[PDB]
Design a protein around this ligand. Structure first.
Ligand SMILES: [Cl-]
Ligand SMILES: [Cl-]
Ligand SMILES: [Cl-]
Ligand code: NA
Lengths: 169, 171
């Protein structure tokens, strides 16, 4: 699809730090890759109703590193978490996105920064980005991930609220 | 084992910004991958470390964390350090880019104004531009490819390649 506006409305509404849609590979069944995202976090360096520009710029920088443009020194540590997630690919069963696809239900990580590296492969990247809460759930034939620098106890109403905001955007 | 001390002596001696040894994949004939490097460029942060290996070891540690005691965070790096770090991800087919070109041709490729090089010759010309790297040189060496680059404009000088190989083997 193109999911950019849906991701933006839903992340900005719940006021979390970022969202990613992990989509199933066209070529490799049961392999998740980066589909699209929205970055809603802090920046240190500077009609777009939904503030898509910084997300489009982080994407452009990722594409140039992986072979008003941003340079690497412009990013916060939270922006680097967002950008390096674009490189990640998950086998069904693998990590929190692969886990959520296989299990067919949410994985809600509180204290994500301390999660076992075999449950959450990104726990140390989360720690450097001050990301505390990370949530993955099956949605639209892929996996929707949201994370925040805030500590939020497991609340299935947040997931319901994102799916609804997403589908009505 | 490793080339870290050899790379350090030779890059620090010629006073260039960095060196990389691209080594042929054990698994894939004619594919180059990152073997080892030495970063000799600017920084913005701050047992005897004679050759200043620590920052190179820290840039490697940060790369391994990004690809899944004084560890670096991404915000700590200069734009030249980012060139050095993202090179660790790159893989080249024989014939492909300047390292693959150097392996295939069996001789040096000396890029001046590397920031303006055609992207089919030098895949990294825009990364070079963001890192203020002007001169990039690859040549076959030890069954792989040695790459050196600098923020300076240095016209083609095969005596630089001779001095690096000699410094490298006498290190
Ligand atoms: Cl020094
Ligand atoms: Cl290249
Ligand atoms: Cl030059
Ligand atoms: Na994970």
């Amino acid at each position: 699809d193109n999911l950019k506006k849906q991701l933006a409305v839903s992340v900005r509404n719940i006021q979390w730090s970022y969202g990613i849609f992990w989509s199933v590979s066209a070529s490799q069944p049961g392999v998740l890759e980066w589909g699209d995202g929205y970055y809603n976090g802090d920046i240190k360096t500077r009609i777009d109703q939904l503030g898509l520009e910084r997300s489009e710029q982080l994407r452009e920088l990722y594409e140039s590193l992986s072979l008003a443009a941003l340079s690497p020194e412009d990013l916060t540590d939270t922006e680097w978490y967002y950008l390096v997630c674009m490189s990640f690919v998950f086998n069904i069963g693998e990590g929190i996105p692969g886990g959520a696809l296989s299990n067919g239900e949410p994985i809600w990580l509180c204290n994500a920064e301390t999660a076992d590296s075999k449950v959450f492969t990104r726990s140390l990247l989360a720690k450097s980005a001050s990301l505390q809460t990370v949530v993955c759930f099956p949605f639209l034939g892929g996996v929707l991930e949201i994370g925040t620098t805030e500590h939020i106890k497991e609340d299935m109403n947040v997931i319901q609220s994102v799916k609804t905001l997403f589908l009505e955007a």
